[PDB]
Amino acid sequence: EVVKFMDVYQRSYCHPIETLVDIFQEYPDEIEYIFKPSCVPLMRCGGCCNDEGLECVPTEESNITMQIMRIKPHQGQHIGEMSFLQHNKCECRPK
Amino acid sequence: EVVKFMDVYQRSYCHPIETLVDIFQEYPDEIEYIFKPSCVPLMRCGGCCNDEGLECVPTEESNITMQIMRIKPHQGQHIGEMSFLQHNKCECRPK
Ligand SMILES: *[C@@H]1O[C@H](CO[C@@H]2O[C@@H](C)[C@@H](O)[C@@H](O)[C@@H]2O)[C@@H](O[C@@H]2O[C@H](CO)[C@@H](O[C@@H]3O[C@H](CO[C@H]4O[C@H](CO)[C@@H](O)[C@H](O)[C@@H]4O)[C@@H](O)[C@H](O[C@H]4O[C@H](CO)[C@@H](O)[C@H](O)[C@@H]4O)[C@@H]3O)[C@H](O)[C@H]2NC(C)=O)[C@H](O)[C@H]1NC(C)=O
Numbered sequence: 001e002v003v004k005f006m007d008v009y010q011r012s013y014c015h016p017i018e019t020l021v022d023i024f025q026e027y028p029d030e031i032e033y034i035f036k037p038s039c040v041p042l043m044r045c046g047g048c049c050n051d052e053g054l055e056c057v058p059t060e061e062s063n064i065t066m067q068i069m070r071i072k073p074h075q076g077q078h079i080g081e082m083s084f085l086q087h088n089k090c091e092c093r094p095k
Numbered sequence: 096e097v098v099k100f101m102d103v104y105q106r107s108y109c110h111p112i113e114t115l116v117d118i119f120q121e122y123p124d125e126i127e128y129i130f131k132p133s134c135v136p137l138m139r140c141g142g143c144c145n146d147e148g149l150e151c152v153p154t155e156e157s158n159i160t161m162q163i164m165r166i167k168p169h170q171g172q173h174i175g176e177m178s179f180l181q182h183n184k185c186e187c188r189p190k
C-alpha cells in the first residue's frame with residue numbers, strides 16, 4: 001500500500017528521467033515537414049535535490065538517433081533518422 | 096544504435112509516465128512544513144496523440160500514499176503519510 005520513505009526519496013532524487021519532448025522544441029527551425037510521432041521519449045535530468053542551494057543538472061550528455069516519419073502534406077511520407085540530445089548523468093550542483 | 100520507428104512511436108504515444116511533481120503543487124495550502132523529498136514520482140498522462148484534434152487525458156485515476164518527511168524548522172522532523180493523485184489509464188480523446 002504505502003511507498004516507504006527510502007523508496008520515495010531515492011526515486012525522486014535528481015537523475016535522468018524518461019521525458020516526452022515535442023520534436024519542434026528540439027528542431028524549431030523545421031518549416032517543411034510534419035513529424036510522426038510528434039514527440040519523442042528522451043532521458044533528461046529532473047527530480048529534486050532537497051537543497052535550495054543546489055540544482056539538478058546534467059554532467060554527461062550524448063545523442064540518441066531515432067527513426068522518425070517526416071510527412072510532406074499530400075506529397076509523401078518517409079522514415080528518416082534524427083538525433084536528439086539525452087542526459088546520461090545528472091548531479092546536484094551549486095546554483 | 097538507432098531506435099526503430101515502431102519502438103519510438105509506441106513509447107511516445109499517450110500513456111501514464113513517471114513524472115516528478117513538487118509537493119507544494121499538490122499541497123499548495125501547506126504553510127507550516129517543509130517536505131523531504133520536496134518532489135514525488137507520480138504516474139501522470141503524457142506523450143502525444145499525433146492528431147491535432149485529440150488530447151491525451153486520464154480515463155482512470157487513483158491515489159497513491161507515500162511516506163514523506165515533514166520538517167518544522169528547528170522543532171523536529173517526522174515521517175507522515177500523504178496521498179497523491181496518479182493516472183492509471185490515459186486515452187487520446189477529442190478536444
Ligand atoms: C549531437 O549531434 C550533433 C550533430 O547531429 C547531426 O546533425 C544535426 C544537424 C541533425 O541532422 C542530427 O539529426 C545529426 O545526427 C552534434 O552537433 C555539433 O554540435 C557542436 C556543439 O556541441 C557544434 O560545434 C559548435 O558549432 C557552433 C556553431 O554552431 C552553428 O554552426 C555550425 C557550423 O560551424 C553548425 O554545425 C551548427 O549546427 C550551428 O549551425 C560554434 O559556435 C561552436 O564553437 C564554440 O564552442 C566550442 C565548444 O563546443 C568552442 O571550442 C569554440 O571555440 C566556440 O567557443 C562549435 O564549433 C557542431 O557544429 C555540431 N555539428 C553539426 C553537424 O551540427 C553534437 O556535438 C552531438 N552531441 C554530442 C554530445 O555528441
Ligand SMILES: *[C@@H]1O[C@H](CO[C@@H]2O[C@@H](C)[C@@H](O)[C@@H](O)[C@@H]2O)[C@@H](O[C@@H]2O[C@H](CO)[C@@H](O[C@@H]3O[C@H](CO[C@H]4O[C@H](CO)[C@@H](O)[C@H](O)[C@@H]4O)[C@@H](O)[C@H](O[C@H]4O[C@H](CO)[C@@H](O)[C@H](O)[C@@H]4O)[C@@H]3O)[C@H](O)[C@H]2NC(C)=O)[C@H](O)[C@H]1NC(C)=O
Pocket residue numbers: 156157158176177178179
Ligand atoms: C484521493 O484521496 C482523497 C482524500 O485523501 C486524504 O485526504 C487528503 C486531504 C490528504 O490528507 C490525503 O493525504 C488523504 O489520504 C479523496 O478526496 C476526496 O475527494 C472528493 C472529490 O473527488 C471530495 O468530495 C468532493 O468535495 C467537494 C468539496 O471539497 C472540499 O470540501 C470537502 C468537505 O466536504 C473536503 O473534504 C475537500 O477536500 C474540499 O476541502 C464537493 O464540491 C464535491 O461535490 C461535488 O462533486 C461531486 C462529484 O465528485 C458531486 O457528486 C457533488 O454533488 C458536487 O457536484 C465532492 O463532495 C472529498 O471531500 C475528498 N475527501 C477528503 C477527505 O478530502 C479523493 O476522492 C481520492 N481520489 C480517488 C480517485 O480515490
